[PDB]
Amino acid sequence: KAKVKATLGEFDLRDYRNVEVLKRFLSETGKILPRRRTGLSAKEQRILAKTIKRARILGLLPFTEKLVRK
Amino acid sequence: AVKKFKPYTPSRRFMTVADFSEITKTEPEKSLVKPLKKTGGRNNQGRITVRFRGGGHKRLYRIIDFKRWDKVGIPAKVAAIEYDPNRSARIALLHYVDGEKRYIIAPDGLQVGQQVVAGPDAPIQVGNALPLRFIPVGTVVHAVELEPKKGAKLARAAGTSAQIQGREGDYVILRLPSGELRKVHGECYATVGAVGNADHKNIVLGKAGRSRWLGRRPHVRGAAMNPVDHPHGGGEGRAPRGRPPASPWGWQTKGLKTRKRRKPSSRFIIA
């Protein structure tokens, strides 16, 4: 419905720095988005999450943003 | 860790003595400005003021550097770790490059040939002492002054130690070996690390005799006496406390705080 991968070109998904890239996988809660929404490969999804977490430690990414309007 | 003994005699089957591995091939103490006379089982009137003392082995007194700030910046080599019959801890005879020699309580980890030093400058390398206000919050530390310029008095027993909990004004929070939370002053020096010989708490005297060599006379129960001697006296056949447990002087002795009330030292503590 909006495969996150096709929404952006070539990118080094190991880079734990490009916020605008990774940020598009975190949902409106900080929850690392499922492979049923990122559409990545088995390996892709993995090394991804690892680099995401890496970022969240430097403060480049949220652990949980509170649920907005509802 | 601790030397045991085969039961070739009773009371030898149980007794364990400390291993002196750390003790650096040094029997004699630093005869120099280090040893000194020592004595005495009761007070300056002839009267006994501490029951059940005396008879211990003879002992020379090793002079220990507790201030360690009169040699700021001057480094020193850890020449030796020596045995010391006056404290639970082992001591370290260090040779200052200055040429002067001094005894410091040897901490854990410390071993001969350390470039130990003391001053605000000093690194957070173990063995080094520096005013509390400079030591990074969290660092375990020992041999702390209580007020500035009055030598170490906290955490000196074997394997003891206090931790820095945080700051607040000119004071730093410590958690003493007891567990007390306390605001100690900033300028108060404190040598980094924890006290050597932590295995001490694990020796087992084994026989009644061993206690005697330590200068401890036998200790007699209140119950074993007569009413004339002790509150618990009157032992008409192994009898129970007449209520409620009390000292030879008549004050209660099972939970009964004795710390003074309006002590000024009070407001610097936290339970």
């Binding site: 652990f63 509170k66 649920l67 907005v68 309007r69 509802k70 | -």
Partner: protein, 114 residues
């Protein structure tokens, strides 16, 4: 404490009783209510209706101080969940926002026997 127009509303809703607490932008409370305050006791306290009434009462008491604008913040799952909110609509306060800040561990503390 003092009179203020802007503010916030916290909705605590557990399966056993719902409770709301109005507070100024800093977070410091102004007024509160709950199934017990209203009059209900025991099982009824968990009722969405109870939760409704308490919401109105807390809102009502609030408008008295000067409350008008209020960001809504919910923590719970109780029957008065959205119900407390539906009551903040018709409250007479401007429902400036609505957010779920229900606490939830990243798996750390062992739960009760349930």
């Amino acid at each position: 404490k003092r009179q203020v127009a802007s503010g916030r509303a916290y909705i605590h809703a557990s399966y056993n009783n719902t409770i709301v607490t109005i507070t100024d932008p800093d977070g410091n409370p102004i007024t509160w209510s709950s199934g017990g305050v209203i009059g209900y006791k025991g099982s009824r306290k968990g009722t969405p209706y109870a939760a409704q009434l308490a919401a109105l009462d807390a809102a009502k008491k609030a408008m008295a101080y000067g409350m008008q604008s209020v960001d809504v913040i919910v923590r719970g799952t109780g029957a008065g969940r959205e119900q407390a909110i539906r009551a903040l609509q018709a409250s007479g306060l401007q429902v400036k926002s609505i957010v779920d800040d229900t606490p939830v561990p990243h798996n750390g503390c062992r739960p009760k026997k349930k």
